[PDB]
């Protein structure tokens, strides 16, 4: 399965703006057919801060039908954008080009006002 070598954790997944997710999988200690997700995310979204450096990601992956949910807190040694994003979606391996389809939420502050912005990212396996 191409669902199999995603698991080897050496793939880049690149979205429409050129942001890159580099996933690493480890078997869940307690959940069947589930993996803990780690690795790094390199942001390139137009107009955003915290570009071009690796941010750790974390979440969980369900191998039965290849569904994933993962998150990034935008704090590293280079830049802190005081924000977090969560992506939830599914892998489609049916085409010649594998695609991870996601919806995301970004929680952040503008002045003293909290907000949660929505969007969609499609990542292509490189």
């Amino acid at each position: 399965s191409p669902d199999m070598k995603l698991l080897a954790g050496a793939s880049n997944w690149v979205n429409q703006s050129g942001s890159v997710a580099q996933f690493v999988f480890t078997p869940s200690p307690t959940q069947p057919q589930t993996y803990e997700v780690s690795g790094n995310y390199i942001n390139n979204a137009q107009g955003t801060g915290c570009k071009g450096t690796p941010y750790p990601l974390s979440g969980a992956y369900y191998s039965g039908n290849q569904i994933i949910s993962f998150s990034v807190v935008w704090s590293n040694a280079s830049a802190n954008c005081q924000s977090a994003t969560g992506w939830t979606g599914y892998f489609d391996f049916s085409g010649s080009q594998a695609v991870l389809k996601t919806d995301w939420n970004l929680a952040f502050y503008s002045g003293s006002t909290p907000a949660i912005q929505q969007g969609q990212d499609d990542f292509m396996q490189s």
């Binding site: 801060g49 915290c50 935008w74 704090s75 590293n76 830049a79 802190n80 005081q82 970004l106 952040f108």
Partner: peptide, 11 residues
């Protein structure tokens, strides 16, 4: 040390 921005959307 890391630079600090208001949010991911705004410096």
């Amino acid at each position: 040390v890391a630079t600090v921005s208001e949010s991911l959307l705004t410096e």
